[PDB]
Paper text:
Arap3, a dual GTPase-activating protein (GAP) for the small GTPases Arf6 and RhoA, plays key roles in regulating a wide range of biological processes, including cancer cell invasion and metastasis. Arap3 structurally consists of an N-terminal sterile alpha motif (SAM) domain, two catalytic GAP domains, ArfGAP and RhoGAP, a Ras-associating (RA) domain and five pleckstrin homology (PH) domains. PI(3,4,5)P3 binding is essential for Arap3 function, which drives recruitment of Arap3 to the plasma membrane to facilitate interaction with its GTPase substrates. Arap3-PH1 domain adopts a canonical PH domain fold, which consists of a seven-stranded β-barrel that is capped at one end by a long C-terminal α-helix.
To understand how Arap3-PH1 domain recognizes PI(3,4,5)P3, we determined the crystal structures of unliganded and diC4-PI(3,4,5)P3-bound Arap3-PH1 domain, which refined to 2.1 and 3.3Å resolution, respectively. The other end of the β-barrel is open and features three loops (β1/β2, β3/β4 and β6/β7), which are hypervariable in both length and sequence in presently known PH domain structures. However, sequence analyses show that Arap3-PH1 contains a KXnQXR motif in the β1-β2 region, which is identical to the canonical KXn(K/R)XR motif in PIPs binding-PH domains, except for the substitution of (K/R) residue by Gln (Q306) in Arap3-PH1. The overall structures of Arap3-PH1 in free and in complex are almost identical, with an overall Ca RMSD of 0.85 Å. However, a significant structural change upon diC4-PI(3,4,5)P3 binding is observed in the region of β1/β2 loop (S298-V304), which exhibits an outward movement, with a Ca RMSD of 1.52 Å. However, our structure data suggested that residues preceding L290, including P288 and L289, interact with the PH1 domain core and may contribute to the structural integrity and stability of the protein.
Author numbering: 3 to 101
The structure:
């Protein structure tokens, strides 16, 4: 039962703002990816359950993409190694779910 904990401030692409990056507090506990407007907020602005994620992949310029059946969620980190850590953690959880 993979239960990592990653949390930190990431930039998240907002399509509702005509595709501009907005600061979010993000947390992945192995069951779901939650993003909050602030780490002080009780409730997240959005939640992606692991069961909804079909793929997570890296992209240019320190981005990773969480891809579901109908949607993509694009996050940007401060460094490449940080992006790798989020992407490979998500990939590992998805590999466990898949197997």
């Amino acid at each position: 039962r993979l239960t990592p904990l990653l949390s930190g401030w990431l930039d998240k692409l907002s399509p509702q703002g005509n595709y501009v990056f907005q600061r979010r507090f993000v947390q992945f506990n192995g069951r779901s990816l939650m993003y909050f407007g602030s780490d002080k907020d009780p409730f997240p602005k959005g939640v992606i359950p692991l069961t909804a994620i079909e793929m997570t992949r890296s992209s240019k310029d320190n981005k990773f993409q969480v891809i579901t059946g109908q949607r993509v969620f694009v996050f940007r980190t401060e460094s490449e190694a940080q992006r790798d850590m989020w992407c490979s953690t998500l990939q590992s959880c998805l590999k466990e779910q898949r197997l």
